[PDB]
């Protein structure tokens, strides 16, 4: 059959098509003479789907959409310590305040807001890295997540630098606090070829997908980005991506963004996808009105929502066995604090916090864990206290587990460490050494 | 055997317990001549597991912790649009400015700011509600997601309500702009009793955990807020709970949670976890200095982080079984967008978006599905793909899936609706009528 999300996808093009109100950047006449009615959108899963519609395929410049890929960028190639020192996690609106820099601080709020980009991009590749290098390093790590070596239209960069006058004066205001180094206009012309690297919705679609899964590529699997890395850039996207209107947007919508003033959008959501939106047309904040727009039904009619819990939780446990003398233990699906956390439990309900006279409740709800179970989500967790209901060995099989980060690893180890002492066998049948 | 994550609180307890900077609330004598000795912590899953360590059992006064639960009991009484228009979405400082009330909207800041909470008290039961109702739909909200009836401590009321100036200007000021129809007596006092109800760390874990869930409580598994209030508490909550502070919060932690003068620091990490912790001394800006800390500690060790994704993905396809004229689909787990559109993946897989030329690495690497599938984490979902490497029957299978809210059964009913116009058979073996 044909998937039915493409489908959607071109019903909310045609909907919300049905206008097209704002308009285009009228600060740069490239972008001013821009055709209004174009609009497409792409929606790249973890697993490597990707659904679009409209004219997802047409090229616009990223502009903004690009701070968290030099920000992720730069933090790798400096570290935290470094990247801090210079770019603060505050929130804030465009509206420069020189009060910034004064504080014991002396850093941009944030790397979402041009003073804080200015700052990331001067962090690039190292102190002794040319203007030549940093604007590859750019170009690079965004055309790494997009799949593809990516290009700048510099037609768009001349356009744009001579008429940069507003971004010279973050520069110049940076190096006086010693925020910047080199120049304001090297900086600054970096900074604006940066922005006039070239995607399709699809595109930003797949690089959000990056960011969303921690680091890995949705279409190869292959990590790109440090997890640690991956999470703080979506940290302060949601947190400042849209500036002073960030709280109102985090409740409505729920999806870290960034938006471009070329029109372009860039979508998010930790562990489940990555949005690609496009709309020359600008609303009255700067942002991009149907791309803008586009994100609140998608939030709003599939619940893609940052707040909208989708765990693993007990669905770790793929069943529990007791054969016999022996009880077999199954995990399944990528296993970190959540599933690991419910592998616990089980391990410890085979027979190897609350006062029940107070709570006549939750005794009664715990006296039918099966039912207690599907309420809530612990997958066949409570196959383990039903197995109980001597054990002498216990077999961890482990080929339905996609993956297992650190911390699974220590506590399923940990759990594993806490059995044996209790003078039981552990058989860890686990084929492609995950553990 | 014993579970590792208490003995984990525990070792925390007494690392972090090495020291006790800060000191206690000094604006009210009650909280000012509290032991400062104390400090316990709790973790509260969503299946309905406890973890405890320290003084999780002492009772303290919630003060503001209590906000995100009258805000939550107000949205349910008076809905989205009557509260909306008394208290935004915007994060704010508790230092109060009067340029909050003249914009165009007429409101305070947000609902966890006491101009903001002040507003939701007068919103709790209706317009002609009596001041003794209002307080007790605090108390009542509270208590029911703490799992037993809560009380007020007058002592501690007695000794607010003689230094309650500050409030009382606030509730002046809102009535100023018709943000407040009742007196601010009336206000402040319901007001100062509701942050008098006392609660232990562990109650905190188990409220924290209710909004976790969506709105389920996990000491039962009935439904206690509705998914879409739940939604909106925590996003307000990750905005605006640490006020000036949230952007280096929600980047340093991931945690959405609101801390008490009291000492006590409520958390709910959606999908995941309740969190209590306590601690009586403040840090320089109000909050609980050890709790603070306890949930810096939590989030780095465990990757509870809110951006650090966890979903169930492909995992939702317990297994693709093509018997022969017939195929097996078997669904497990929560399903919501994230499950059910791996579902319709599965479904569309069966015979019934990029350029390869272009994307080399792609190609290569959807060669091997299985490969691509555990980098990434679709369950077995590759396993329909195979299934078709002619099928006139197909089998839902939903033993296995505990719950799937409304996004999911719309999805999954329209693959089926999609199947069927394809000329094949479509039986849904649904024993506890889900679907
Ligand atoms: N490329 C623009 C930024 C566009 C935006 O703010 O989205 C600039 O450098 O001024
Ligand atoms: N209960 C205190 C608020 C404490 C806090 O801000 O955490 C008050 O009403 O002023």
Redo the contacts between chains.
Sequence with gaps: ?????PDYLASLVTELGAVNPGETAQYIPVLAEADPDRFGIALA????????AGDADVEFTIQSASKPFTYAAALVDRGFAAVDRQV????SGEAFNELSLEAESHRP??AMINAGALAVHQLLVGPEASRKERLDRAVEIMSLLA??RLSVDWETYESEMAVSDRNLSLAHMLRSYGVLQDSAEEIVAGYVAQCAVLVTV?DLAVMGACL???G?H?????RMLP?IV???V???M???GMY?????W???V?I?AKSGVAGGVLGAL???VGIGVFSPRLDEVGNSARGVLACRRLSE???????????????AV?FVEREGDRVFLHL???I????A??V??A??DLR???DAA??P??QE??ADRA???????????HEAAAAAAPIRTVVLNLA?V??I?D?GRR?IA??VR??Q??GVRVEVEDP?RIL
């Design positions: 059959m044909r998937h039915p999300i899963t973890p697993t490597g789907r990707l659904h679009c603060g996690l505050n929130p709020d944030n799949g593809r699809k969303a899964t921690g890995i949705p279409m190869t699997g292959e997890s991956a999470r703080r979506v940290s302060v949601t947190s400042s002073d209107a960030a709280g109102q985090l409740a409505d729920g870290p930790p562990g489940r009619d599939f619940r893609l929502h940052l707040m909208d819990g989708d765990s693993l939780g007990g669905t793929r399944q699906g990528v970190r604090f959540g599933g956390e419910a616990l439990d391990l410890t190897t916090g609350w107070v709570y409740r939750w709800a715990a039912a207690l179970s599907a309420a809530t989500g612990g997958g066949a967790v339905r996609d993956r980060d911390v506590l940990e759990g806490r059995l002492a209790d492609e």
